[PDB]
Design a protein around this ligand. Structure first.
Ligand SMILES: *C(=O)[C@]1([C@@H](O)C(C)C)NC(=O)[C@H](C)[C@@H]1O
Ligand SMILES: *C(=O)[C@]1([C@@H](O)C(C)C)NC(=O)[C@H](C)[C@@H]1O
Lengths: 594, 133, 133, 129
């Protein structure tokens, strides 16, 4: 089927481009209902949770906004008390009560606090003993105090080193006492929430000690080698919820420890995309105004439609709010402070210019004939197959693929795979294609032909099954002596039954064959054949959609490998008159030659 | 049940019964139950939140559902791509040399999915070729 | 085969076999074994830039065709027999001049190279003078 | 331009008088000296010196810690501060490859300025040369 301009157009109509948007700030998890529901559970139940999803989704911002809305009863004062000259413990007293004990204590040179029994006694027996027979390291040490629990304590420590988590001992010269202990993030987070990144725990090596804190209540302030002695610190009951944040791949190492999923029972997974709906367009607009942008309708609409193209889906938008914002920040410079449709479309263009050197070199070498390509005419056993070169931002390009057929005993030879350039998935695609070919052409017994296929001027490793349909059409063309259109590039994977399957990077492929056709002069009849199963991933750039609307470029979507061959060879498989006959006659000639 | 009451749970008969039957399903055996008491308890602790303190059959069955929701992203992506035709499958009709073989993808919690498996036969000398192998 | 040739060089050989097989089909399978060696090469060699020289040598050996030894050759070839661009074109040219010069110029020496490299010829003075003479 | 990206050169240094230490003995690094202007660093020095993560922390979190000694009984806490500077990193395509597999690199360095290995051989570039 031919894809008309009307079928391809996917962008959002803009009315009143320049009018300023005014919209309320959405809730912290819009378009992330999974995560929101998982974190509502962890908050209601006191469980530790982990927030997992790709970089730039804004997991941290969303979580800090959510926890800032919570309330808990005012946290107690937290303090270390001495139990001895060499022993200390962490204790809680009701909020505001520490300043009262410390004074009762200071007024003991030379009851009110039931909780402080352990320390009060230890204090008397030392008064007793100095009577019985300075060093004034017998006072409480206030670690935190708080005036309300709205919001609760929220401690995000992005740098998870042992002294930052667990606190630090100071020595005066050694001397050391309970008064010189400083708190870590663990202490500061008591009665509230501690947020840590999974990657810092790993890089800093502090996972095991953090396990011990959560499992066993051992929270040891960090110590020095030199110090003749040191203080024993009693464990204490941990009163905090931990939220860990990271990517699926930051979690992989922590997940092979059984203790991770015992301790972090709530997974809050953020989706990389959300529905492209008017309510998420609206939330995005309010989220942008709340960031401080001066946004106009046309600017919100292009950002929304660029989030759809970043997702490569007409129905879904990319969920990475941090990325939308970064693009909006560059747009703002270009519109002088105002985020308009032009400034968004110009931010986009500038980013493409800034990573375009590789492509400029490429198109120059095609123009000079250093890379040999055809974008017009017919040729037997050759086709523009489309490829993405390994490397961000992953431009697409045509690669000339050739196939030669000779009398021999059923061998389908991929030269790139035999030379070690082809990966396992690419190899799989070749064997699939051999399975299809063998089973379609059975009349002679074994395929009486050797077929070799090469990507001309490819010097790097290639992987994926996305060149299968182009290899198959080239192979049937070489068997049947069928001239193929060189003005239509091809992309698609094929299964053993000859069905065409979805491929990745569809917009890049298309546009990169347009750029080459454009750089060599559009002839009017160029275009791409691609899988019908990718229709929903076409979110093509403006210049291509315009060319298609002008009749100067053409998109064809196919379901089967035979439909691709009929387009490229300009004839039906049946009739007489037909491709199947010419392929028959081809194979019979080879068969006799054998 | 007695072990749970001694942990401090407010348990009801329906709640003990569903926990017991979920321990059987965790063992994947109708005759045996999973012995990991720490795991039964963790599930009971999430059930308790959902029943407001009371461990009932609903709250256990809803704890279970919520855990499945919380690790369901991969499967939601999958079922979307089948619905869109990006993964090509058939669940009706007849076809020669094709079948839905069932697979578990490497990764917790190990969902199951159909994979279309095809076989083609041609004249040649006894070769059974597994393409993936 | 001895392990001196890299993957790109190997690719060039298979391409050349693809070209040879498909040009000479009248007898069925190519009724010949063709072996190609770089004489006195003791190091690893990589690149497809010797393909055209391997192909002319192979057609010469099949056809019993005497070849000029006063013209060195460079170029990659694709399966269709088209000659393709190669790198280090000025070095190649000039280094065959130096050898011809060191052994005494005969007047008829020279190099055959890809038309697609015309724009990369920025030859040194001594070669351009010899060509002018 | 600090071509030698060690932690004491980037983030400054504490001196101790004998210990004693105080606010008066802190020396600035390139980060401090670059405030309200531009800091230029080489990608290869960040990697060789191992200071990429700490430099991330400076740009992301505002943590700029002067470098300290093992011996010192105690030490000073340094509050984060808001960073006011633009960083320009310099290097080859291959110096960038290692830094590019960190997501945080392209979050933090959003402008790629790629120099071409050749330019047009024209009379205006002959004249500029
Ligand atoms: C297709 O699978 C693909 C093609 O470039 C090669 C030639 C098979 N491989 C890829 O990695 C890119 C993304 C293409 O889809
Ligand atoms: C050509 O690809 C090349 C030849 O030396 C060998 C014999 C193929 N390989 C190279 O690395 C150099 C640069 C030549 O171009």
């Amino acid at each position: 089927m031919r894809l008309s301009y009307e079928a391809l157009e996917w962008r959002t109509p803009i009315e009143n481009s320049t009018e300023p948007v005014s919209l309320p700030p959405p809730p912290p998890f819009f378009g992330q209902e999974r995560a929101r529901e998982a974190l509502e559970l962890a908050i209601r139940g006191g469980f530790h949770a982990y927030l997992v999803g790709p970089p730039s989704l804004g997991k941290h911002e969303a979580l800090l906004a959510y926890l800032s809305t919570q309330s808990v009863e005012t946290p107690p004062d937290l303090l270390y008390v001495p139990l001895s000259e060499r022993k200390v413990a962490v204790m809680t007293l009701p909020s505001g009560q520490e300043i009262h004990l410390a004074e009762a204590v200071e007024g003991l040179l030379l009851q009110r606090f039931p909780q402080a029994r352990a320390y009060l006694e230890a204090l008397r027996a030392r008064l007793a003993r100095y009577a019985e027979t300075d060093p004034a390291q017998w006072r409480p040490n206030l670690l935190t105090s708080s005036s309300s629990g709205t919001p609760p304590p929220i401690v995000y420590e992005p740098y998870a080193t042992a002294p930052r988590l667990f606190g630090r001992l100071d020595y005066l010269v050694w001397s050391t006492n309970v008064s010189l202990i400083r708190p870590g993030a663990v202490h500061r987070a008591q009665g509230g929430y501690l947020i840590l990144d999974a990657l810092s725990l790993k890089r800093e090596g502090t996972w095991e000690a953090f396990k011990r804190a959560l499992r066993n209540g051992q929270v040891e302030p960090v110590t020095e080698p030199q110090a003749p002695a040191g203080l024993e610190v009693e464990p204490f009951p941990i009163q905090m919820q931990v939220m860990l944040v990271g990517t699926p791949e930051a979690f992989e190492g922590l997940e092979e420890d059984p203790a991770f999923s015992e301790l972090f029972r709530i997974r809050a997974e953020f989706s990389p995309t959300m529905p492209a709906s008017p309510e998420n367009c609206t939330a995005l607009g309010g989220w942008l105004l709340a960031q401080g942008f001066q946004l106009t309708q046309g600017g919100l609409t292009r950002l929304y439609d660029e989030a759809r193209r970043m997702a490569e889906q007409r129905d879904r938008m990319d969920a990475r709010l941090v990325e939308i914002r970064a693009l909006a920040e560059e747009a703002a410079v270009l519109g002088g402070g105002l985020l308009t449709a032009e400034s968004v479309e110009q931010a986009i263009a500038a980013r493409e210019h800034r990573s375009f050197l590789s492509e400029e070199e490429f198109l120059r070498a095609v123009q000079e004939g250093v890379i040999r390509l055809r974008t017009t005419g017919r040729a037997v056993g050759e086709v523009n197959s489309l490829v993405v070169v390994e490397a961000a931002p992953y431009w697409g390009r045509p690669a000339r693929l050739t196939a030669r057929a000779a009398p021999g005993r059923d061998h389908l030879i991929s030269i790139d795979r035999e030379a070690g350039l082809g990966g396992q998935i690419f190899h799989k695609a070749v064997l699939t294609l051999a399975g299809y070919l063998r089973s379609r052409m059975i009349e002679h017994g074994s395929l009486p032909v050797t077929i070799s296929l090469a990507f001309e001027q490819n010097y790097v490793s290639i992987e994926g099954d996305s060149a299968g349909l182009a290899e198959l059409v080239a192979a049937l063309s070489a068997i049947g002596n069928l001239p193929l259109r060189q003005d239509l590039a091809v992309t698609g994977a094929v299964d053993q039954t000859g069905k065409v399957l979805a491929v990745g990077a569809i917009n890049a492929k298309v546009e990169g064959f347009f750029r080459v056709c454009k750089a060599l002069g559009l002839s009017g009849t160029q275009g791409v054949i691609l899988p019908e199963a990718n229709l929903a991933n076409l979110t093509l750039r403006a210049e291509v959609l315009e060319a298609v609307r002008a009749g100067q470029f053409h998109i064809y979507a196919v379901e089967t490998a035979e439909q691709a061959l009929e387009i490229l060879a300009g004839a039906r498989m049946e009739g007489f008159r037909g491709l199947q006959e010419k392929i028959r006659a081809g194979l019979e000639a080879f068969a006799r030659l054998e």
